[PDB]
Amino acid sequence: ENLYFQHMKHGRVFIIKSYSEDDIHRSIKYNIWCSTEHGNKRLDAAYRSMNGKGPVYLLFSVNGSGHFCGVAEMKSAVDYNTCAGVWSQDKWKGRFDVRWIFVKDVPNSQLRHIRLENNENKPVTNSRDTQEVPLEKAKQVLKIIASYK
């Protein structure tokens, strides 16, 4: 048995949807990310209120790819005044640190049965960028990602 993810009552988990394979590569290389203005605010608020008592996990997926491409932990608050033009969208304003945990493709078929009660019971695979995942469903997603081969 694998009971690791069942025993943890803190932590928050968000879906990250990227249009750009380049941005994913840059994020893995440099352990940084940036979302939209409203996405950055949502993640910043979550990281800050955690105050280090548990992780903020990011579940990454490229729009249209049909799979998740990995998992990272948020590792800093959002710095909103950084060098412009480092990403796909040249307007994107800001940067936060991440630490990539798992880099592997996980097909949407492995995950489409998990549904989000905070997003109209839609499959977790049909989420938009910075959709939060309820912790009890996030445990199920993380276990599937960690045991897929």
What is the distance between the alpha carbons of residues 138 and 144, in angstroms, rounded to a whole number? 10
3-state secondary structure of 33: strand
Which residues are known binding-site members for RNA? 17-19, 23, 33-34, 63, 87, 92
Q: How far apart, in whole angstroms, are the C-alpha atoms of residue 69 and residue 47?
A: 22
- Break the chain down into helix, strand, coil percent, rounded to 5: 30, 30, 40
Return the CATH fold of 1-149.
ph1033 like fold (3.10.590)
Rg of the chain (C-alpha set): 15
- Residues making up the annotated binding site are 17-19, 23, 33-34, 63, 87, 92
Pairing of strands 56-62, 12-18: parallel
Among 71, 73, 130, 79, which Cα is nearest to 99's? 73
Structure tokens at 104: 């592997």
Q: Provide the residue ranges of all domains of the chain, joining segments of one domain with +.
A: 1-149
Would you call 147 exposed, middle or buried from its count of C-beta atoms within 10 A (0-12, 13-18, 19+)?
exposed
